[PDB]
Symmetry: C2
Subunit: 734 residues, 2 copies
């Protein structure tokens, strides 16, 4: 009962069917009637008729996005499915809203289509709609929205008409609306009557109307003569429940304070890509936002201006509930303590985003003066030594990595002019626990005194630099250091009998993660790496081939507590038997992928009784041992994809085996002896040049007898020979 072409799985007391990206030309009739969620996205389906979803009465969600990669859907093709609640029809080239849609629809998405008319024949009958996404359609000179087409939808909570030539706000909208998205809708004027009966609205998006074109991923055209969006003085007078307001890219050169007169619950205000340098210095509207938590005034700079200081209005002190302030792209030369005086008394202000400001000098003592700062983002400055469902205007990704941020106070000084750690670099700073010094052309010879002013740093990112850590005292001032990242570090001052010297590692009593990736380590001097606390070591992108010379045979034996070792991208052709035996016995994960391994001694796995994962992908291995069970009794996952294995040898802990992208021609009956209690739950085999003759017949019987072994991508398990079966899956054989 192995399903094809859908990889079905149980989810929240209901079986679902993942059938996406399988090159299907039409709706498959081999889908179980018990499924509730069918996903057929990224396929070549061209027609949707009444017989497409025949007998699937329990279908509550259908995803038919990107079909074909136009779509001919007949009238009333989905009406027969009485339980259909969520229907996604994105990127289908539909010229109109499909007719005969079932009234049970609570979620309908018709994004990236050719829908130019919003008719009552396809919308008004859907009285149970809660979410309606009609983005990217007339992006027709204007979208034809029928008068009162949404009035019948008394249950609508979200209406997204973004990226459409609207020009005017649609009249007669349902009072139940809570989220109104109208971004890039060409609406140059907002009146009081546009949001008359929307007293329960909690979100209003009016961004991209009269935009300031700055690195837009979509077409951008200004309002002729630098015109701003004309919002009426009483346009938001009846929006008492408004929490989110997006006025990004609206060429605003003045903010009327009366807009927030009856808006006391406003939590997020977006004002990026405007011309509010003057409004930041005066700020009349700032005294009207006592419950605002996120204020974003990014990329509001004056073109061709590089002022000495940032002019922050005193009225910024009236934003008592503020938690995050994003001031990217303001462009200024110096940040003094006096400049950020209106922000120092805000109790909840934990995030200050000053990225891409080209600040040459910062008085870092002003950060001590803040009451609850947790994130200080200063990336892309000049500090010197000593997808339609996306937010396209706001920096939504975490400014600093959540793993770094979890340790405590975070400071990001990456992409700055810190070419060496100065003696006064970290003086007068708060108790920093997370620090980013990435991409700074830093060639500091770490001698054990550089980070003394911030000694409680636990997560230190020193990637993309030219640092020298040959000294044993390097970074020892950070006693509580737990994660050190030296990814892509290029040694700038190599000594013949010194570089690379990793003696500083054994000084740390709590360092758990160390990333020495892409360091170009081809020489070592002690020659071993000792540490009683180190758990994870990333030695990828180095030269282990050169090291493994009989002096570096026990290079990692000192790391007694090491559980994860990544030896990928090391140009390893053959790991010596003595060198492999000197690896820590405590290892649970070993990644020796993307190398040039021609042979691998499986016999050596007997000295690793805790090894649960062995990654050997992207190699040139040809032979597999016939007695693996004798060497390992704990190996749960074995990845061997993109190798040259052309034969599987004959003959309980192994649950996952990856044999995809290999040279396997067939699987014989002798290797299918599963009379033993082997708990195999996953077996990948896609990309093998199989023989669809009577040789694969014995393997086909094993697949039907052992249904618990999951074989993914059944459409990609293709047999190359013979010509009659070239291209077809191995499961569609006589």
């Amino acid at each position: 009962s192995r399903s094809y072409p859908c990889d079905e799985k149980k989810q929240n007391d209901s079986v679902i069917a993942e059938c996406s990206n399988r090159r299907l030309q039409e709706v498959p009739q081999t889908v179980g009637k018990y499924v509730t969620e069918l996903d057929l996205s990224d396929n070549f389906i061209t027609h949707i008729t009444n017989e497409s979803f025949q007998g699937l009465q329990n279908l509550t969600k259908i995803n038919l996005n990107h079909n074909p990669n136009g779509l001919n859907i007949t009238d009333g093709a989905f009406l027969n499915l009485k339980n259909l609640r969520e229907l996604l029809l994105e990127d289908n080239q539909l010229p109109q809203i499909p007719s005969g849609l079932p009234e049970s629809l609570t979620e309908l998405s018709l994004i990236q289509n050719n829908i130019y008319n919003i008719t009552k024949e396809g919308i008004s009958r859907l009285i149970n709609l809660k979410n309606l996404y009609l983005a990217w359609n007339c992006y027709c000179e204007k979208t034809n929205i029928e008068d009162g087409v949404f009035e019948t939808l008394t249950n609508l909570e979200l209406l997204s008409l973004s990226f459409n030539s609207l020009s005017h706000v649609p009249p007669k909208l349902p009072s139940s609306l809570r989220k109104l998205f109208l971004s890039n809708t060409q609406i140059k004027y907002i009146s009081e009557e546009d949001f008359k009966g929307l007293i329960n609205l909690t979100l209003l998006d009016l961004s991209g109307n009269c935009p300031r074109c700055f690195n837009a991923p979509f077409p951008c055209v200004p309002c002729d003569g630098g015109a701003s969006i004309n919002i009426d003085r009483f346009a938001f007078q009846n929006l008492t429940q408004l929490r989110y307001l997006n006025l990004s890219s609206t060429s605003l050169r003045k903010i009327n304070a009366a807009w927030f007169k009856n808006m006391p619950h406003l939590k997020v205000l977006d004002l990026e890509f405007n011309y509010l340098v003057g409004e930041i210095a005066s700020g009349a509207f700032l005294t009207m936002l006592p419950r605002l938590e996120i204020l974003d005034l990014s990329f509001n700079y004056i073109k061709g201006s590089y002022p000495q200081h940032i002019n922050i209005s005193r009225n910024f002190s009236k934003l008592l509930s503020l938690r995050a302030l994003h001031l990217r792209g303001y462009v200024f030369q110096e940040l003094r303590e006096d400049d950020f005086q209106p922000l120092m008394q805000l109790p909840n202000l934990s995030t200050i985003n000053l990225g891409i400001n080209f600040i040459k000098q910062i008085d870092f003592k002003l950060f001590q003066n803040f009451s609850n700062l947790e994130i200080i983002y200063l990336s892309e400055n000049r500090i010197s030594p000593l997808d339609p469902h996306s937010n396209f205007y706001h920096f939504t990704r975490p400014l600093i990595k959540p793993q770094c941020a979890a340790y405590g106070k975070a400071l990001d000084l990456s992409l700055n002019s810190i070419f060496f750690i100065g003696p006064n670099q970290f003086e007068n700073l708060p108790d920093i626990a997370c620090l980013n010094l990435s991409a700074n052309s830093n060639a500091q010879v770490l001698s054990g005194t550089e980070f003394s002013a911030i000694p409680h740093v636990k997560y230190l990112d020193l990637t993309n630099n030219r640092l020298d850590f040959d000294n044993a005292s390097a970074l020892t001032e950070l006693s509580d250091l737990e994660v050190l990242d030296l990814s892509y570090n290029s040694h700038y001052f190599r000594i013949a009998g010194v570089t690379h010297h990793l003696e500083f590692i054994q000084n740390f009593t709590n360092l758990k993660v160390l990333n020495l990736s892409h360091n170009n380590i081809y020489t070592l001097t002690k020659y071993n790496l000792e540490s009683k606390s180190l758990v994870e070591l990333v030695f990828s992108g180095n030269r282990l081939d050169i090291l493994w010379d009989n002096r570096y045979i026990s290079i990692f034996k000192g790391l007694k507590n090491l559980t994860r070792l990544d030896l990928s991208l090391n140009r390893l052709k053959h790991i010596p038997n003595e060198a492999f035996l000197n690896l820590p016995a405590s290892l649970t994960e070993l990644h020796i992928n993307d190398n040039m391994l021609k042979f691998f001694n499986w016999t050596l796995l007997q000295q690793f009784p805790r090894l649960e994962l062995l990654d050997l992908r992207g190699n040139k291995l040809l032979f597999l041992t016939d007695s693996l069970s004798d060497f390992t009794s704990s190996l749960r996952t074995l990845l061997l994809s993109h190798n040259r294995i052309s034969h599987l040898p004959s003959g309980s802990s192994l649950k996952h085996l990856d044999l995809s992208s290999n040279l396997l021609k067939t699987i014989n009956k002798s290797a299918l002896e599963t009379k033993t209690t082997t708990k195999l739950s996953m077996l990948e085999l896609h990309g093998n040049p199989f023989e669809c003759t009577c040789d694969i017949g014995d393997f086909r019987r094993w697949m039907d007898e052992h249904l618990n072994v999951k074989i993914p991508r059944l459409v990609d398990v293709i047999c190359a020979s013979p010509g009659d079966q070239r291209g077809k899956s191995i499961v569609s054989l006589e």
Copy 2:
């Protein structure tokens, strides 16, 4: 008489046989006896015997470098039979000792990158005619065993290079004829007066890499324990009166004794990079001893962990009257004021100032007007804000600024700085700049014809790797004399839907000759016609011509009436429309449509281009070639069609096309060349035909083509070892010329 495997060529009344990189396992005996220079480098030769160069009496030069390429067994006296051998190169051969029985007629001998640990008299002393001796990279053994007086017999030696060898001490008893002594990275920590006693004719002394300051060395680097410097005696250079070149780079020098240059009045080049001379640059007692010095290099002499406000240049820098170039890279300082460079302002010949990689935050650009003859101002890798064993491994030898830029006049390199926008005071108080480099500055300036007004005589402008906006028709129009504009890899930052790209600014130039709009990602344009009467070269590579030509941009380049070179490569072009191709300038002499996805090319359209001499169509998917090319073009001299899918050559392709001298048909799908296409009875002047990388058929089909090669010896076919036939199995791998 077509030679194989050597591509022989005549040069100055003597033949020279190029036989390098041909995968030869042994010395070929099919080399003409008339040749004088044989080059068999980069091959798999394993043995050199007396029969290797048999009958080649006229051989004056033999190059056997890199043999084999992943040792070399040379018998004793294997080269003695060649009485005229003057130059012998034996580099990277894993020779354990200097070969014995070498001919006495050797004037040049190179044994670099070998395992030679002993310099014996049995292999060197007999060569009394040696002028150049290169023995670099050998004991790089605890020390090189140099026999006492092994070089004394070599009375004609002018150059001795013992660099990259564990020497520890300067070899005693050196020939008085020596003029160039190279001893770089030789582990010599002490120099005495007796080391250069009888070397009064020495013009070059290299002592670099002895007690080094390890900074980005491409070879092993180890300091002298406890930061020790090279100990040069007070009278070590007392008898070197003819010294012109002195290399003391990477010698950990923290003090320069002025007495070293007491009897050295001809010193022209002094190298002092990678030392600790910050204090010596501020005091400089030795500076008053160099009146004829032209090149002084004090680069990467910085104090680690120090970022001083100013550069301390001694007043004694005014005593370097003959100075032409000063290289002060890696000093590390925050500000350059006019007063700081006061000792250099009165030097008449000072034309080059190298201040690269200094992290200077502010420069008073006015100071450059006080200089009498500044031609090159290199300031790359600073912080200015808006408003191979045969190599010199320590000195920046490449031209700081591209010669084509520098040729215009005063050059200023401000690349890799922090000029994120052109400030209003950016170029004020500068001299009359003709060459300006502003590459890679994250520059998002909206060009409006008012930015370069302070230096309006800029002729070569480099604005590469920036995010500039030149949509205004007035962009760069204040630079009236602009001749070369480089806008490569420019990523627009403020795209307006129906405005970008607006290239109407090009029309306002009366002297612009070269324009490079490569990798600009131009997929939409605004009239949509580019006009110019002076433009000669246009590089439109790395753009989206496929989108533009698929009906508003059909005559995109017709306005460029004087255009001679057009590079339309890397534009993802599958099919150039017939109307779009006909609208190309008729004045075109070179047309490069390479590295595209062209499936078809209309050869008929070449009739409207009577001056087209070069057609580049490499890296394409073309299958068909017209059988009447002579009817369409009468001037096409070079036709490049390599890396295409052409599987058949039509009959009469070579006929009636007398202008064609070069045809590249390599890396194609040609199986064979028939007799019908070899009709060369016409006066066709074909001088070069490339065919390497074709899956040829070594059967009787290729026999008729073989006869054409022997009859027409004037047609040069390069890489004969790479013209390999894939079929049949018996001839798979072998060249087509080694057939029955």
